[PDB]
C-alpha cells in the first residue's frame, strides 16, 4: 500500500508568481542606476539557466552555486555592469521576502503528515533547500528532505529517488511522488515503481499528461488519489 508521499519544491509548493517577482527584484538589486532594463536581464538570465538545467538533467551533481554564478558573470561581461560578488547572498534575501506557498500547501501537508511519510525531493543544494524551507516555515512539516547533493545526481537520475525511498524505508510501489515537471518528476519517479501525480494548475501540460499516472491542478486532490489507491 501507499505509505509515503513525496513532493517537489519549485513549481509545486512555492508560487511561480512569487519566484518570478523575487528574481526581478534580484536583478533590480544587481543593477539599479545601470542603464539596463532589469526585465531584459531577467529574461536573458532565465534563458541561460534553462539551458544549464537542461544540460545537467539526469547527470552527476555539481554545485548550483557555481553554475548560476558562471551565468551571471557571463551576463555582467556581456552588458558591462559590476559582477556582484554577493550574488548568492542577494538571491536568498529576495526569496525569503517575496517567495510564498500555494494556498493549499500547509493544509495538504498537515493532512498527509502523521498518517503517511511526507518527504521532499529537490535538485537544489542542501543548504539552499534548508534555508528555503526555513524561510517559508515548513521545515518541520516534512519527515525527510532529499537533495541532489546527497544523491550525487540531478533528477531524473534514479539515485535521487532511491535515496529518498531508503530514508523512508519504503519500496517504490508503496510511495507517491508529486511534481510539476512531466519528464523530470513523473518520468524519474516512475523508473523506481513510484506512483506519479503531475501538478498542472494552469492546464497547460495537457501535451504531457500521458507520461504521468494522475493529473491534478490543486494539491488538495492528492489526498483523494492516495486513499483511492489504498
Residues near Mg ion (CB under 5 A)? 8, 10-11, 180-181
Give the nearest distance from C-beta 74 to Mg ion in angstroms. 24
Give the nearest distance from C-beta 154 to Mg ion in angstroms. 12
Secondary structure (3-state) at 134: helix
Of 149 and 180, the one with the shorter C-beta distance to Mg ion is: 180
Give the nearest distance from C-beta 45 to Mg ion in angstroms. 18
Of 181 and 189, the one with the shorter C-beta distance to Mg ion is: 181
Give the nearest distance from C-beta 156 to Mg ion in angstroms. 12
Distance CA 21, CA 46 (A): 13
For residue 156, cis peptide bond before it (omega within 30 degrees of 0): yes
Alpha-carbon separation of residue 6 from 9, 43, 84, 104 (angstroms) = 10, 31, 36, 16
- Residue 101: beta bridge partners? 14
Give the nearest distance from C-beta 179 to Mg ion in angstroms. 6
Nearest residue to Mg ion by CB is 11
Q: Which residues have a Cβ under 8 Å from the Cβ of 198 and sit 6 or more positions away?
A: 179, 180, 182, 185, 186, 205, 208, 209, 211, 212, 214, 215, 216
Of 58 and 84, the one with the shorter C-beta distance to Mg ion is: 58
Of 12 and 195, the one with the shorter C-beta distance to Mg ion is: 12
Q: What is the DSSP letter of 60?
A: B
Give the nearest distance from C-beta 82 to Mg ion in angstroms. 32
Phi-psi region of 2 (alpha: psi -120 to 50; beta: other; left: phi over 0): beta
Of 11 and 84, the one with the shorter C-beta distance to Mg ion is: 11
DSSP H/E element including 4: strand 4-7
Of 75 and 197, the one with the shorter C-beta distance to Mg ion is: 197
Amino acid at each position: 500500500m501507499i505509505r509515503a508521499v513525496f513532493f517537489d519544491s519549485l513549481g509545486t509548493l512555492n508560487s511561480v508568481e512569487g519566484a518570478a517577482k523575487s528574481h526581478l527584484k534580484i536583478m533590480e538589486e544587481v543593477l539599479g542606476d545601470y542603464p539596463l532594463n532589469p526585465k531584459t536581464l531577467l529574461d536573458e538570465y532565465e534563458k541561460l539557466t534553462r539551458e544549464a538545467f537542461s544540460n545537467y538533467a539526469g547527470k552527476p551533481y555539481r554545485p548550483l552555486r557555481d553554475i548560476l554564478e558562471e551565468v551571471m558573470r557571463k551576463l555582467a561581461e556581456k552588458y558591462g555592469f559590476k559582477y556582484p560578488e554577493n550574488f548568492w547572498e542577494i538571491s536568498l534575501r529576495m526569496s525569503q521576502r517575496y517567495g510564498e506557498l500555494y494556498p493549499e500547501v500547509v493544509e495538504v501537508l498537515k493532512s498527509l503528515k502523521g498518517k503517511y511519510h511526507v518527504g521532499m525531493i529537490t535538485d537544489s543544494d542542501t543548504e539552499q533547500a534548508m534555508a528555503f524551507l526555513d524561510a517559508l516555515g515548513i521545515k518541520d512539516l516534512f519527515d525527510s528532505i532529499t537533495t541532489s547533493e546527497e544523491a550525487g545526481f540531478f533528477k531524473p537520475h534514479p539515485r535521487i529517488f532511491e535515496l529518498a525511498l531508503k530514508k523512508a524505508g519504503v519500496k517504490g510501489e508503496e510511495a507517491v511522488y508529486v511534481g510539476d515537471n512531466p519528464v523530470k518528476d513523473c518520468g524519474g519517479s516512475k523508473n523506481l515503481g513510484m506512483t506519479s501525480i503531475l501538478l498542472d494548475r494552469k492546464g497547460e501540460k495537457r501535451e504531457f499528461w500521458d507520461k504521468c499516472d494522475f493529473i491534478v491542478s490543486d494539491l488538495r486532490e492528492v489526498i483523494k488519489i492516495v486513499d483511492e489507491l489504498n
